[PDB]
Amino acid sequence: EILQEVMQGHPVLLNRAPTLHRLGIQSFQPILVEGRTICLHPLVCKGFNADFDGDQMAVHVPLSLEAQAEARLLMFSHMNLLSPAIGDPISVPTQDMLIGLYVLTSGTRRGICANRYNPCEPFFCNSYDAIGAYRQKRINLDSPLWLRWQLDQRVIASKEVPIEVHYESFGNYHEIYAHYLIVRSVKKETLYIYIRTTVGHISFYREIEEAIQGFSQACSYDT
Amino acid sequence: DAGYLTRRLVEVVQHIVVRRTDCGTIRGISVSPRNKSRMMSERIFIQTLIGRVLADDIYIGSRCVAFRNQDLGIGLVNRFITFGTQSISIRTPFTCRSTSWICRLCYGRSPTHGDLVELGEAVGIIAGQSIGEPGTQLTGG
Amino acid sequence: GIQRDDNGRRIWRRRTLTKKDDMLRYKLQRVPFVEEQVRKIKEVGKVMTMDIERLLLSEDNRFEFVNSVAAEATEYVEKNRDEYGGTKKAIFHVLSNRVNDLGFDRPEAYAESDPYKPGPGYLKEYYT
């Protein structure tokens, strides 16, 4: 119990003996974990090139308060994300982390891969229903769906004129683009937008948005 | 071989540290985007001008678009390409009035922090590692 | 300029946004499902990470900042030797104070207890 509270707030330096980069030695906040082995973050194991066919690290505990200060404030992983060589990120997702994201954003099958014959989908009022329907096995991850978009035009699609515009005689005209439907009117200025996407794209977009909001609420400078 | 090259590279510049704000130099390396594109790509030409501190004012007619000791971002660099200016003089470690150290302006903007480099940064050792680290990364006719 | 009615009170034009802001309707919403994230962030300790950067935003040299923090942390421990040994750390107390000096609110030294700890001998095993 004393050891658990002692390590709390005291950073340690993890060093790979066959050192590779400036990240070959780095500081982490230790947490007491079970077993007889040193658990390490998957992302930082690429900065250390820490293969899991066998590796042993040397760990050093700063003693002086000055050393503990600069270990926490200069060597922590959250402040060293850009490689000084060119200024590119180092903790980029790789391996199965990149595979999982690729599968998420690998959207619907298109064209002849989706329909057996030449033609010659659910509408969700918000992303939460689309996620919820996916949980209830109502739709697949890659199954196409229409999302009622309340924000501004935000999706990145090739700048192309609408595939087809359905101009009703009463002034309402629908603009069918390659990836979204926009319902404008002459009498009014409703500007309804429906995005044709998948749960995977919604899940990936929601994950980034929730991460930002979750970090903002935790660091509530407003209060 | 790369590990041996790292030790020699870091040794020659182990003493280089950002110790002054502005060394007061006036000479700047002049780069022109019209005599260069014939050999190398334009994309890498942007990286050469990203993070640099301009050594002299740049004018487009009577309009002044950049100033001396002004950091160069992608917005300013793209402006130079679009309007086809050529008298671009930037501060480089070649233009610093010292060899045992380097000032902040002559070096430029730190790639890691996205702002002007801070005093006391062991910038020489960073340069040595930035070249030695890619050492372990280096037909039809 | 000055205009008053019969009662003598002053009547002024209430300056209001005449036109319409597109971004106003696109940004007032808040996500509802970050309760587990915000709790995890505080428990992990990333709330200090944002505070550490926030202090560096108003700083001129990050090497002077750590020296100042280390100097102030050494000052704290000299005054109160028997306080910064366990759940409270000297450096974390400095960081919490420096954030509180800006006018914001943080727990002292970012220290957190375990309200769900069953017994004195039970220490939270970490699921690796």
Binding site: - | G120, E121 | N67
Partner: peptide, 8 residues
């Protein structure tokens, strides 16, 4: 770094 000048 932190040792630049004398820390002051």
């Amino acid at each position: 770094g932190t040792g630049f000048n004398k820390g002051l």
